[PDB]
């Protein structure tokens, strides 16, 4: 049995905006799992959640 | 200051002392109500507002 592309009509898309205070980031992203986005971004920046 | 003012015609000193009772409170119980929202993320960090 062959695979299959998700083929959501909206491609992968995000905007990451640093606030400029206390290394606060806001992440606007087309995802199904915000808490996971928060984790991997915080980890990558070595920041608390 | 009394000594000074007896010896100086064009320059005078003065002293004063005032007391304070400053009451605190608003008109009703409802005016003093207050609220907060606290999250604890899975890394243990806290967000409060």
From Swiss-Prot, chain A:
Segment forming the signal sequence: none
Transmembrane segments: none
Domain of life: Eukaryota
Entry's localization field: Cytoplasm
Family the entry assigns: Belongs to the xanthine dehydrogenase family.
Subunit structure: Homodimer.
Miscellaneous remark of the record: AOX genes evolved from a xanthine oxidoreductase ancestral precursor via a series of gene duplication and suppression/deletion events. Different animal species contain a different complement of AOX genes encoding an equivalent number of AOX isoenzymes. In mammals, the two extremes are represented by certain rodents such as mice and rats, which are endowed with 4 AOX genes, and by humans, whose genome is characterized by a single active gene.
Name of the protein this chain belongs to: Aldehyde oxidase
Organism the protein comes from: Homo sapiens
Gene: AOX1
Residue window of the full protein shown: 745 to 793 of 1338
